Design a protein around this ligand. Structure first.
Ligand code: PDD
Ligand code: PDD
Lengths: 382, 382
């Protein structure tokens, strides 16, 4: 893949490999690692991360919905994939045909799938139990037993596993977390027999209580080198390696006289003679307008974004006259300076999770592995 | 194209067609309309909108950078295309080969392209002049005259047009706008001869002062049925037809008991027995966490999002028990209720421009024309 705009993200797959391999060491040899690669691998590239994770010790993959699993299959992934979200009963055969496990939490969903699917491929289901997140999952025993029976009844339906998800595993206080964990052990008692795969832990839960993970953990945010929360940062077993960086280059440089305005609404006025540089990145690239008072790195120093951010471009105040083509780092490091995803998240008043997911399809991803450029991924490429 | 999650955006091409035809009527017959379809047509589907705009009266198209023009070419667009932003001198030949016009604002860029391009295809350039926006464009006569000469010297370099862009055309007070407009007429004098294409007006400027547009206008935001700003809303010559709407469906429905918590951080607590619905859309789809206290439309009534929004899902309080599969509208209308992009923009504290662009590649676009589904566009499809 090739691209024609000097703006690109870089994904360090060696970082991703180390983050996963280190967990593989920390976990019991009997414990599976399921790599969560939904939302294009949290904006890092679905197939590239999936392969590296499998390479580092992950044995299974997880996506948000069916479309995300089929895409991985088409790209050549043959590892098992679990759809964590909802799916249509009418798509059961497709999922069964492609060897994709489905999450189930409603007995009426199964009644539908049953009437539509007869075989010959078996469907692996994972029972979701709501223990306090309030998102998806069964809540009562009656509904739970009903589901187990329907699966039991059908020759091609198999209950491969069951799980829950924690709402506060990244909180230093573990009161709610303990309630959910206890609720889980109680509900597992509703099952006639324990499925071969029992899971509940996410990045935070598996890194904090690796002994309470059962047979499989679902590794997400931490695989990308980002802490589930600033609060638990000082409690993580090993150092995480940030894998995502974002860069651009100056395409224009000019000197403004005092009084000259910049950008929409003319909300910025040069106080004195200053050098303004224009970079080819805007909010359609995920660099939201709310980043208007943030700073970028240029020539090793912090340069403030001046004026409002445009759809495809934005201006910054430079230290002096720098040459067009000069590299600008928006996320990453230059010399001694560095800007992490956590820094961007803080200014945007959101969590790190949301930042890389928002860097759009317009921004090509360049992959590094073994300290070398592996491949380029340009969504709007040829 | 097909999709397997019950979440999709709908683009009404009839609206797009009407918004453009109405301008074609308002402008002098000698004035060209160049449809701005960068950022995948402001998130509406680049080729689908481009074809409709050309059908309605547009004669040319504009994109942000080269990659966007190439894609339109691959997808079968033959109409003239202008790249509004920066491009590499080394890509001049590729542009010339594909009949793509380029914006130029530096003489040193031309020096480079000259040395690298010899023909036989001619390159059509549009000279960008900075009149107060502070983004791109020449600022002085010396640099201007220099660019004209270089273009003149090369046999395959053609100066097809020259333009500027306004920073405050959507402001009721036209003080800065007049200065810019006046600056433009002054700088145009620097040109030995007027290029066949002089342009400066965007949506706001062309709708307010269609008599000051010259030979071509660059129609963007208004083409999608969105007002350049709320301030000029009452000054628009004709009613704009919103083309974008966003929907999903309930994938889970349950009753919470007083005291039960919902979502991350367990920030939401059921006060009484209530019905919570779960929908398959989250922040990786562009439904940013900041919309946490907003509402959606369900069964014709407003339903408040409860708890934090997740990457792929969120919860809403329901009037009562509704059947799973019930349609939810996030942007659009249901019965008497409606949610416009302007409403979402207000809650997110940004402008309408930014909202459709942020609805990600994960959300399929369903196109309507003549009141019938035209096609489906799933970015992560097969
Ligand atoms: C050079 C140029 N011409 C024409 C337009 C169309 O403007 P409008 O959508 O308001 O009609 C734009 C706006 N672009 C995006 C919005 C920007 O700079 O943020 C532009 O940059
Ligand atoms: C069911 C499920 N399992 C596992 C994970 C991985 O969590 P983490 O990234 O914290 O390790 C998630 C989180 N998803 C996204 C983040 C959400 O719900 O917003 C999940 O939904």
């Amino acid at each position: 893949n090739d691209f024609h705009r000097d703006t690109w993200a870089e994904v360090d797959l060696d970082a991703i490999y180390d983050n996963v391999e280190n967990l593989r060491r920390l976990l019991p040899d009997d414990t599976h690692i399921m790599a969560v690669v939904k939302a294009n691998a949290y904006g890092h590239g679905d197939v590239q991360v999936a392969r590296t994770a499998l390479e580092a010790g992950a044995s299974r993959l997880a996506v948000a919905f069916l479309d995300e699993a089929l895409a991985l299959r088409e790209k050549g992934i043959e590892a098992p994939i679990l759809v964590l979200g909802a799916s249509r009963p009418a798509d059961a055969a497709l999922a069964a045909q492609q060897r994709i496990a489905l999450t189930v939490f409603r007995s009426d969903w199964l009644e539908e799938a049953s009437a539509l699917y007869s075989g010959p491929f078996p469907i692996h289901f994972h029972l979701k139990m709501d223990t306090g997140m309030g998102r998806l999952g069964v809540k009562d025993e009656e509904e739970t037993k009903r589901i187990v029976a329907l699966i039991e009844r059908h020759p091609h339906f198999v209950l491969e596993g069951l799980y829950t998800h924690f709402a506060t595993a990244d909180e230093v206080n573990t009161d709610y977390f303990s309630y959910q964990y206890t609720r889980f052990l109680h509900m597992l008692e509703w099952l006639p027999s324990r499925p071969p795969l029992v899971h509940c832990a996410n990045s935070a839960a598996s890194l904090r209580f690796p002994d309470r993970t059962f047979n499989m953990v679902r590794f997400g945010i931490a695989m990308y080198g980002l802490a589930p929360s600033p609060g638990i940062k000082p409690l993580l077993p090993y150092p995480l390696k940030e894998a995502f960086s974002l860069h651009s280059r100056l395409v224009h440089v000019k000197k403004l006289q005092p009084g000259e305005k910049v950008s929409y609404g003319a909300t910025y006025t040069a106080q004195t003679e200053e050098w303004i540089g224009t970079i080819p990145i805007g909010y359609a690239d995920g660099w939201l307008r709310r980043l208007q008072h943030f700073h970028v790195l240029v020539d090793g120093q912090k340069a403030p974004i001046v004026g409002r951010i445009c759809m495809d471009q934005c201006m910054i105040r430079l230290p002096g006259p720098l040459p067009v083509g000069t590299k600008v780092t928006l996320i990453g490091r230059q010399g001694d300076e560095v800007i992490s995803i956590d820094d961007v998240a803080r200014h945007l008043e959101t969590i790190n999770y949301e930042v890389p997911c928002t860097i759009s399809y317009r921004v090509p991803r360049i992959f590094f592995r073994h300290k070398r450029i592996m491949e380029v991924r340009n969504a709007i490429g040829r």
